[PDB]
Every structure is written in structure tokens, then in C-alpha cells.
Design a protein around this ligand. Structure first.
Ligand SMILES: [Mg+2]
Ligand SMILES: [Mg+2]
Ligand SMILES: [Mg+2]
Ligand SMILES: [Mg+2]
Ligand SMILES: [Mg+2]
Ligand SMILES: [Mg+2]
Ligand SMILES: [Mg+2]
Ligand SMILES: [Mg+2]
Lengths: 132, 138, 51
RNA sequence: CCCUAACUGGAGUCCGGUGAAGCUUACAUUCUAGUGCACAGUCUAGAGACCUCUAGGGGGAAGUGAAGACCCCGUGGAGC
RNA sequence: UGGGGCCCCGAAAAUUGACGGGGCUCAAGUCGACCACCGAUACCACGGAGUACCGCAAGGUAAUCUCGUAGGAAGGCGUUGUGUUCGGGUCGAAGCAGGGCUGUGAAGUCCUGUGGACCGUUCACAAACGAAAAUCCUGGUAAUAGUAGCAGCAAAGCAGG
RNA sequence: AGCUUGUAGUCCGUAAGGGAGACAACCCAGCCCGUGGUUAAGGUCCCCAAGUGUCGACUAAGUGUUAAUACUAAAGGGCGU
RNA sequence: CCCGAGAAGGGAGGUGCAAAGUGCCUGAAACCUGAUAGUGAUGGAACGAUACGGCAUGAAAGGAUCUCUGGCAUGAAGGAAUCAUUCGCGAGGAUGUAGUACGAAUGUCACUGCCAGUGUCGUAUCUUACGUUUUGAAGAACGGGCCAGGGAGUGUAUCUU
């Protein structure tokens, strides 16, 4: 375990993102709770008379770039590290453990996953998914 | 325990409704027949017989006849009584014709701003007169 | 003529059904790109020039 | 018909067996008024309303059935 | 006698109903003034996102940037395959049900279960490439409903074995 | 005529949010996200956040408690005040 | 082997890595049966969004100066209370106290074992579905019972850019 290298400005932006994404709406397509044929993913409302397209506050927030997280901490894991998806053993050499944590690919077999874990542990690299 | 004798009906009702919505007490109102309604007797009687005989029998308004029930209804219209807060407020209100035997001898209070001696004329009727002209026995 | 070798014709209005062409001796819809077994609208053409 | 009554058999009603179809975006115990594309169970303010079930005639759902056959329009037809 | 304020008469409609309702009379009405307060996403402050223009870059400027139908313009997500680069999989691929995390989002990734053999990825290139709607099509399946019908034209069965 | 046909401005159409009971187009306001504050229109008896506020009068008819308003009755009269 | 009228079926027991048990790979949804969580016979309807609570859950994939609760420092906009003087017919105003105490937040030090998330219900505010035709759609205008899958800018020639 190596301490996360995050300077105070990045810490402040990380806490800002925590607070702001705590308030971000789920951005479900309008009326997805009303029909089982509809998915929960976002679709832009298109009808002229649609209340969400007309931006009634009660109907839920529209997707818009104002909800973007701070650019310095955008995409980071909630632990503060950077998510790096490792699809094989050879990808662990490009990662430095100061600010990056590897996520092992979900289809990696147990035989190779054990070796990847041994190499990550010798390198000191944080692992987001393992067996514990 | 509020003594309704010589009190304006609407002003007493507004005071009691706000107190009930301040949510810390049970309010008892006694002598509801002795509450006052300002205005000429003909106009008040006309409006109360219009309200009394309005609705539909299967559906319509059932405006009460007893003065205590009329006073409770008057307070009922100044509350969100269809809401949990308003239902709680109405459950904590008891209105009486005269003094109930249990409350006999208890210390009462009167709302100074609902007093009928603040009226500038003699155009008023008591709630009991309205109730008995609507056919209520009390 | 894939999906198009039928003689299907529409029922018209007055039967409570869509106006799609149907088989002459059944209600099964035919020949239209949104009918099952119907023709592909805008398929690949052997006459297309890819060079 | 005044003015309906009683009675008979078959249904219905209740029980066993068998066993479909047609209306349906959702919700829905309503009533009044207003409002609103000027004909609202759902909006607004009131008034009511404990739930479930059975029977019953059809007030309402501008009930259901049918891309109005009346009128007009289409540089649409047909026959005469 | 003239000129003024407010009110009254003139003043009749159809389900029970409308100052929004309760109600209100030196007012909770009207008129002339005034005081304090409440009350938006407005305005101010801080933090954040994007955008426009400038800048070799670092970055700078925005009181004079941030709503939007028809519609134009830009950049991305996804599906299947091809060339090519680099991989994963019986120590468990795809798919499926549910969940965690990231992303404004299209979506991606991971976890658990199930499953038993295939699946991705770089840079590019293609297309039979994305559905909630068409009285859409095909299949499956509800409510209706244990309901209608199993009566009307020839009401037929019972006892015993 | 909530009729028909012009014109200028501004809106709805395509305009959120706040306020008028509700209100396409009436008032504040044009609106990236979050937090704090102060206001706008409008309101402050209760429903309902904030006045049972102040001063000076009027009204006795529950008149009224209705900015604009398609949502609000006239001529005429009154030794009512 | 047992039950069963049984050449049905069920139970038990086997085969097989796995029932995959014969229209048998995987085995979604609608629909139906049961269970669990929440709620529930005084209750108001676009079924949600937002905030705060009750109950349940919170293994993995989410947090560990993270969650809880406090102290201290700095703090933008904003900014008191109380009291003194004075003005006002009055409600109140002004001046001082005081740009002070406080204050979004930013740090720091302790304390704590939860928090995030998820399901359901409650309270508060807001919203009369969606697509379409429309000047105007919640409409008593048209379309859809539901779910799954299918379902619509393509090629040749030519001109222009
Ligand atoms: Mg013509
Ligand atoms: Mg557009
Ligand atoms: Mg579909
Ligand atoms: Mg205007
Ligand atoms: Mg239009
Ligand atoms: Mg406009
Ligand atoms: Mg608005
Ligand atoms: Mg499809």
C-alpha cells in the first residue's frame, strides 16, 4: 500500500466532485418508470409538448454539460486513484503506483489473475478487484 | 380551554386554527352557542340557510346544525384538514355547547382581539340563534 | 424479388386493421419492409460499384 | 289502453361440470363549480369518501363497434 | 342650488357552490399615505462544467457567453464485419438476472449468480448499423372471467341390476 | 362577437423558474451545475412564508374582499350617508 | 423400490463434468403461482423529481482523516442581537455598539463506526402522460392492452459544390 499522491488542489477538486456528484440526477429517459418496454438510459426528449423537453423542474433534469465533474479529478476512482483496466500481465509495466490503481479485466482467468496479482503486489500497485 | 362567549366567530377560528397548527396543545372551546357573527341578522340568516340547504343528498355538503359543530366546521376551513398536519390539528380540537361537565370549573381564556366589544355597531347575532333557526336542538 | 413475389393487397379501411398489403386468402401481411418475410428496404445491390 | 294482476313452461337467480370474445397508455371511491381547444373522474378551490363482495336497471365514462356514406377539398376515380 | 366619494334601488334562470376557500364590519372591504417583513433559477458572492475568441505553449478575456420548435453546423457513443496492431478464454467466452464504480450523456467497466465455447483491442475502413409509437408486422401472453354460451325451433327421463 | 381583415411594438408558437385559484401568449424573469445571501413581481387573519401593522377618513350593502382581463350589468333615481 | 386404476404421473434412487431427461444447449420479458421487504380496510389519482425522516438491506464490486460528533484558525457576498442617544403623530427610522459576533467554504486537531447505495412507506414543494395533428393537446382530437423480435435516406447515371 502506497500513499495516494494528490496535491491539495487536487484534493479540493476531489471533494468538490464528491459533493457535486452526490447531487447529480440519475438522468433516466422520461417515462421509463411507466412502460416496461423502455430502458432507463438517457434519451433526449423530442416531442413538442413533452414536459421534460420543455424543462419543467418537476419532470427531472435534462442532460447538460453543467453537470460535468471538475476536469482535474474527472474519471478518478472514488478512492482517489486512476482506474487502469489491465487486460494482461504485460500492461502492469506502464503503471506507476503513486496515482494509479489497476482494475483487472473481468474475463481474465484465475490462473493468470493470480500471476497478475503477484506482479502487482511486488510492484506495490493497488488493485481495485481481487479475491479477499 | 377557550371561552367563546362574546367572541367573533371567524377571528376566534383563525386564532385557534393557528394555535392548533403550532402543534403543542389540545384546544377546548366552550360556550360555542355564545359566539358572535357580525352583520345584520337578515343577511347572516340568509347566508346560513343558503349554506345549510345547498348540497346533494348522496354527495353534497352536509353543513352541520349544532353551534359547536358549526364552530368546528368554521375552524375546519382554516386548516389543511385533508393533510396529516390538519387531521392531527382537528383531532386536538373539541368544541362544546355550554360547558361540559368534565371541564366545569376549569380555568378558561379569551382571545382579546376576537372580542365583540371591538365591533362598532350592534349588527350581530349569536351562533346559537343561527343554529336554532336552522332547527338545531342544543 | 425477395419478399415481393406475392399478390398481397390491402384490406382498406373498415376492418379495424392496418392498411398494409395482406395475402389474398388470409390476413397475413406481406411484401412491405416492416412485414415479416417482406422485402428489405434499401438492401445491398449487386449492381453497386465499389471500385 | 284506463291499470294492471295472477298463473304456466324456458332463461335469469343459486350449485356442479365445461369454458370463449369484444373496449384497455396509465392511474382511478367520487360530487359541485370554475378553468382549460369555449362539453374534466385526474387541472384549480371546495365538498365528500372505511374496504371487499353479491344482485340490479342502464345515468355518465362526450361507453364500444366502423380512417363519416352528410358537407367541402383533391389540377383523385368510376359509370352515365 | 351646484359640484364630489362610497353605498342603496333599478337587479329575473335553470344539478348544490364559489371573494380560490374559511371567514371578515373603527375590517381581513374602499380611499389617501406610510412603516417593517416574507418572497425566484432575478441580482450579489464562492466553487464547478461547457462554450466563443486569442495565445507556439503555459494560459488569458467574457457586464457586453450559457432558453429554444422547423432547421443548419461540430464532436462523440453503440451494433456487425474487413484490413492491421496487441490480447483474453474450460483456473470458465458470449449471453442472461441483479448490483458496484466511472462518464453531462450516448455508454463503458467491474462484482455475484447462471451459463459451457468462444470473445475482444490499436489505427483505419465499411454497412442489410441503433425504435416507444406507423388502427405498424410476426410470435407469445393478460385483463375481461371461472364470466357469456352449453335454454327458446322435438321441456325426458326414473327404478332395479 | 373568444367575429373578420390591417398596422407598430412585444410575446406564445419555440420560454423554463417566481406570482396571479387554476391561466399558451397577464406581472417579475429570459434559464449551465452546486451552495450561501439579498431582492423582484406579488403578498403578510387562517388555509400559507411574512402585519389580526401605523396614521387619516369612508362603507352597513357580506356592498366588497376581481391589475390587464374574451373571466367585471346600464339608463334613470335616492330628504342613505 | 414405494404410491398410484395406470405402459400416466409423482417420490426415492441412479447416469453424466454438467440434467442437458428426448419439440431436451443457453433459456429474457410479458403473463401466471408462491415467498420475502415495506405498506395497508379515514383514503385522492400521470404512478415521478427534489429535500428530510421510518422500516428493511447494505457479502463482492464503493469510501477509512471515509462516516458521525465537536474544537480551533482563515473566511466572500451578506450581517445581527442587546443596550445608549436622537428623530417620528404612530407603526418605526437614524447614529453608535458594528462592518463587530456570525457567515458558503477552506484548512487543521480530536472523537466516532458508520456512510454511500438500494427497496418500500411517510411529510413538504412542484408537475393534468407520451408521440402526433395543431395558433392552441391533460383533452370530450388521432395512436398504442402488454412484452419480445422485425421495422423506414438506398444504388446507377448525371450536374453542382
Ligand atoms: Mg388545386
Ligand atoms: Mg432543432
Ligand atoms: Mg418494439
Ligand atoms: Mg406581452
Ligand atoms: Mg407548430
Ligand atoms: Mg420567444
Ligand atoms: Mg411560467
Ligand atoms: Mg429491434
Amino acid at each position: 500500500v502506497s500513499t495516494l499522491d494528490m496535491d491539495p488542489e487536487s484534493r479540493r477538486l476531489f471533494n468538490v466532485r464528491k459533493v457535486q456528484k452526490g447531487k447529480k440526477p440519475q438522468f433516466k429517459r422520461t417515462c421509463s418508470h411507466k412502460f416496461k418496454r423502455l430502458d432507463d438510459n438517457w434519451r433526449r426528449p423530442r416531442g413538442s409538448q413533452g414536459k421534460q423537453r420543455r424543462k419543467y423542474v418537476s419532470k427531472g433534469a435534462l442532460v447538460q454539460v453543467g453537470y460535468g465533474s471538475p476536469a482535474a479529478v474527472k474519471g478518478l476512482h472514488p478512492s482517489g486513484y486512476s482506474d487502469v483496466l489491465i487486460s494482461s500481465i504485460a500492461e502492469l509495466e506502464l503503471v506507476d503506483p503513486s496515482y494509479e490503481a489497476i482494475r483487472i479485466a473481468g474475463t481474465i482467468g484465475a490462473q493468470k489473475k493470480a500471476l497478475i496479482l503477484a506482479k502487482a503486489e511486488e510492484a506495490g500497485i493497488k488493485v481495485l478487484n481481487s479475491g479477499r | 380551554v377557550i371561552d367563546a362567549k362574546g367572541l367573533i366567530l371567524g377571528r376566534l377560528a383563525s386564532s385557534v386554527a393557528k394555535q392548533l397548527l403550532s402543534g403543542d396543545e389540545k384546544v377546548y372551546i366552550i360556550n360555542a352557542e355564545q359566539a358572535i357573527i357580525s352583520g345584520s341578522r337578515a343577511a347572516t340568516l340568509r347566508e346560513y340557510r343558503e349554506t345549510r340547504e345547498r348540497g346533494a343528498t348522496e354527495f353534497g355538503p352536509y353543513f352541520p346544525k349544532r353551534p359547536d359543530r358549526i364552530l368546528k366546521r368554521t375552524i375546519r376551513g382554516m386548516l389543511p384538514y385533508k393533510r396529516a398536519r390538519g387531521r392531527d390539528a382537528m383531532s386536538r380540537l373539541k368544541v362544546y355547547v355550554g360547558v361540559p361537565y368534565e371541564l366545569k370549573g376549569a380555568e378558561t381564556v379569551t382571545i382579546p382581539d376576537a372580542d365583540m366589544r371591538l365591533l362598532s355597531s350592534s349588527r350581530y347575532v349569536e351562533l346559537g340563534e343561527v343554529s336554532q333557526k336552522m332547527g338545531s336542538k342544543f | 424479388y425477395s419478399g415481393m413475389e406475392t399478390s398481397a393487397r390491402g384490406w382498406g379501411s373498415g376492418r379495424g386493421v392496418s392498411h398494409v398489403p395482406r395475402l389474398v386468402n388470409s390476413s397475413r401481411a406481406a411484401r412491405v419492409p416492416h412485414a415479416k418475410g417482406g422485402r428489405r428496404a434499401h438492401p445491398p445491390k449487386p449492381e453497386a460499384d465499389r471500385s
